[PDB]
Amino acid sequence: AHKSEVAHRFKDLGEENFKALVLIAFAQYLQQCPFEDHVKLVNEVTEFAKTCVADESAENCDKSLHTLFGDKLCTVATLRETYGEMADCCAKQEPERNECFLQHKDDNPNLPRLVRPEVDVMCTAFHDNEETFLKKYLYEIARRHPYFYAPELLFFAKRYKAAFTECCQAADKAACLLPKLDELRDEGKASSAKQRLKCASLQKFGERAFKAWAVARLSQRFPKAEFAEVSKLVTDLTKVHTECCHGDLLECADDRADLAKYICENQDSISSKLKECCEKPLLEKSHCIAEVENDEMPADLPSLAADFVESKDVCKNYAEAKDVFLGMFLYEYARRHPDYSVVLLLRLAKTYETTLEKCCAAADPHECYAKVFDEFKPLVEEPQNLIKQNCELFEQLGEYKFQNALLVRYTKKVPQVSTPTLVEVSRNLGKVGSKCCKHPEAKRMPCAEDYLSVVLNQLCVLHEKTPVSDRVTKCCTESLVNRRPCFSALEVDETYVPKEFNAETFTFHADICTLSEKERQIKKQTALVELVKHKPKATKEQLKAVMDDFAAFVEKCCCFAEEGKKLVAASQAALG
Numbered sequence: 001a002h003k004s005e006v007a008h009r010f011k012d013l014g015e016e017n018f019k020a021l022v023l024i025a026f027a028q029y030l031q032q033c034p035f036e037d038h039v040k041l042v043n044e045v046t047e048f049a050k051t052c053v054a055d056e057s058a059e060n061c062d063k064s065l066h067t068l069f070g071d072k073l074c075t076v077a078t079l080r081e082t083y084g085e086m087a088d089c090c091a092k093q094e095p096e097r098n099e100c101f102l103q104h105k106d107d108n109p110n111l112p113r114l115v116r117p118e119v120d121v122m123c124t125a126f127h128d129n130e131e132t133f134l135k136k137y138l139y140e141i142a143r144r145h146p147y148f149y150a151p152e153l154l155f156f157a158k159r160y161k162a163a164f165t166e167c168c169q170a171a172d173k174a175a176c177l178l179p180k181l182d183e184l185r186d187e188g189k190a191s192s193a194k195q196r197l198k199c200a201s202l203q204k205f206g207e208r209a210f211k212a213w214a215v216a217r218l219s220q221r222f223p224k225a226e227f228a229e230v231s232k233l234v235t236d237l238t239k240v241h242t243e244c245c246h247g248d249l250l251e252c253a254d255d256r257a258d259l260a261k262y263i264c265e266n267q268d269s270i271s272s273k274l275k276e277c278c279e280k281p282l283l284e285k286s287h288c289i290a291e292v293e294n295d296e297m298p299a300d301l302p303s304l305a306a307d308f309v310e311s312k313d314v315c316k317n318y319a320e321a322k323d324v325f326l327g328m329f330l331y332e333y334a335r336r337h338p339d340y341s342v343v344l345l346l347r348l349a350k351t352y353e354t355t356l357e358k359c360c361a362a363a364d365p366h367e368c369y370a371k372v373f374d375e376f377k378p379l380v381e382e383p384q385n386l387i388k389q390n391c392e393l394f395e396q397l398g399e400y401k402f403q404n405a406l407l408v409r410y411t412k413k414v415p416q417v418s419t420p421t422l423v424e425v426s427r428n429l430g431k432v433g434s435k436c437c438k439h440p441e442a443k444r445m446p447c448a449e450d451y452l453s454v455v456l457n458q459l460c461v462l463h464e465k466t467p468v469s470d471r472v473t474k475c476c477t478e479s480l481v482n483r484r485p486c487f488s489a490l491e492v493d494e495t496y497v498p499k500e501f502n503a504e505t506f507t508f509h510a511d512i513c514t515l516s517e518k519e520r521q522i523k524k525q526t527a528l529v530e531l532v533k534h535k536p537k538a539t540k541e542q543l544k545a546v547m548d549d550f551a552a553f554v555e556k557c558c559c560f561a562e563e564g565k566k567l568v569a570a571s572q573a574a575l576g
């Protein structure tokens, strides 16, 4: 409702942030334009912005942000030659022009791998012209991730900027930097697979599924809030998520900032943990809030049995308004259990619902639903037990060999997944082990759910459109809370015909000695999957015996071709 919207945004964000976000937003629409062209356009938009700051009444200062972006986009002179139909958007009036740009954000980019320079070269470059070096990489990530919400991409950039400061100075520029950059990469990976999971989930499962999830997550977060307040938050969050998924950066950022403002003007009835977030500038407020730790729950909440099992009014209260009642149940359950994953809370509410449907229909409903809590039993135990055993295995073996145990396990279940994907999914599950198994027990399930749900959804995006397995499509298109259970119930594939021996696959040279850590790991792991694909029936003593001998073939050789010939020979018979 301001006179100059571009001026208002520039005085609030601050110039450095405004330039960064302008660069991100243009790079996400104009993906094939070279860095220096985006620089020129940024400088132009920034300079016009300043005229509005100095005089809100200056020409064109009163146009909306949408109009000004669209107008700028339509002055790029090679728009049609490079973008084709996207130039057709320019002929259209603004409500419509802006919708048209939205439908044309490419997403298969098609760009070439971004190779990390050598550390020596990045530090050098960071030092000689810090902004070009950072800004160019923001541009590179943004054009390769055109749906990544722009302020979050800016928040990560500030993290890289921090890291180069830190490390481009000390005794070793590899023992400071590399593990920071590697942690930033996995974490950026997650953040992005996560935004796509939220949006695709809303389509597949519906607003109702989505809302159940939010009731649960926010009840865990704000266990002191009243249900009515939790429900108002999920209704507004639902609408935000919905606008953000439609994709218009300004509209998403407006709704998110409105929700932030509400949250902060109501801290006392939501959470004693919001003080710091609610002091942050607008740009980081909502982001801080979505990341806040769970508040402490209030002391000695009653058990759930009274309102949900014991009351004579159960069926009556349910049937008046079934979703509100199930949402009260889910709220009451989740506030008590910061330690459950959200999907387990859903599985629990969905169980309570299936039980009230059957039983409320009976002459004596109470006798029928009297044991429902006992049904929550094994639902809770199952994920806790799988987590417990996998962290113990992880403790017993360490990451790389845990990764290896995960390879033979998953290759036997779904041998017809390609070798790189199996390698990839297993190295990554190993990372979820090493990050989640450091939580005590009462944090492990929420952790595990976070990362696995990310890892599985991408699994499921790959598979779709490159289908190799009916059992993977089954798990990938299951309901939301059934997905991870479905993968977990996968057994060793008894259908699978062994891959025929391939001579080249188990022949290695001197290189493996000299390549890096990682790459030697991938190479050995590729071979191992290949090993399992050829003898799907190998027992574990037999695999180990063969793995110990590969490491002894590698150990003493660094004889690659004649021994390897008898590495193979000996192996094809300890497995024959």
Ligand SMILES: CCCCC[C@H](O)C/C=C1/C(=O)C=C[C@@H]1C/C=C\CCCC(=O)O
Pocket (backbone or CB within 6 Å): 108, 109, 110, 111, 112, 113, 114, 115, 141, 144, 145, 188, 189, 192
């Ligand atoms: C062997 C690949 C190494 C990593 C890939 C490059 O470093 C790009 C850098 C990214 C980043 O930082 C965040 C997201 C992208 C990568 C994600 C998906 C690419 C798949 C579809 C596509 O990009 O065509």
Ligand SMILES: CCCCC[C@H](O)C/C=C1/C(=O)C=C[C@@H]1C/C=C\CCCC(=O)O
Pocket (backbone or CB within 6 Å): 114, 116, 117, 122, 133, 134, 135, 137, 138, 141, 153, 156, 157, 158, 160, 161, 184, 185, 188, 189, 192
């Ligand atoms: C992404 C922050 C915005 C600006 C951050 C710094 O400019 C980056 C500087 C880099 C560097 O010097 C070497 C590698 C990174 C780029 C890496 C991956 C791209 C996508 C990975 C992801 O999804 O974060």
Ligand SMILES: CCCCCCCCCCCCCC(=O)O
Pocket (backbone or CB within 6 Å): 009, 013, 021, 022, 025, 065, 069, 150, 151, 249, 250, 253, 254, 256, 257, 260, 282, 283, 284, 285, 286, 287
């Ligand atoms: C398509 C043109 C993009 C407009 C430039 C970005 C404006 C900055 C929005 C940042 C506000 C974030 C609000 C929030 O996420 O809580």
Ligand SMILES: CCCCCCCCCCCCCC(=O)O
Pocket (backbone or CB within 6 Å): 205, 208, 209, 211, 212, 215, 231, 234, 323, 324, 326, 327, 328, 330, 346, 349, 350, 353, 479, 480, 481
């Ligand atoms: C797999 C997704 C469905 C999970 C739903 C299980 C039963 C809980 C229903 C909650 C309905 C949303 C009502 C609300 O809490 O606002």
Ligand SMILES: CCCCCCCCCCCCCC(=O)O
Pocket (backbone or CB within 6 Å): 341, 343, 344, 383, 386, 387, 390, 391, 429, 432, 433, 436, 437, 445, 448, 449, 452, 484, 485
């Ligand atoms: C911390 C476990 C290391 C990673 C290995 C895979 C184990 C999967 C445990 C599943 C818990 C999922 C949450 C849920 O579905 O309720």
Ligand SMILES: CCCCCCCCCCCCCC(=O)O
Pocket (backbone or CB within 6 Å): 386, 410, 414, 417, 425, 452, 456, 459, 472, 484, 487, 488, 489
């Ligand atoms: C493409 C499917 C190959 C298997 C790779 C990951 C399988 C899903 C794992 C989910 C976490 C482990 C599930 C489990 O073993 O209980």
Ligand SMILES: CCCCCCCCCCCCCC(=O)O
Pocket (backbone or CB within 6 Å): 404, 506, 524, 525, 527, 528, 531, 546, 547, 550, 551, 567, 568, 571, 572
């Ligand atoms: C029939 C071919 C026999 C050689 C193929 C064996 C592949 C062994 C990979 C095992 C590496 C995991 C343990 C390690 O890196 O030391």
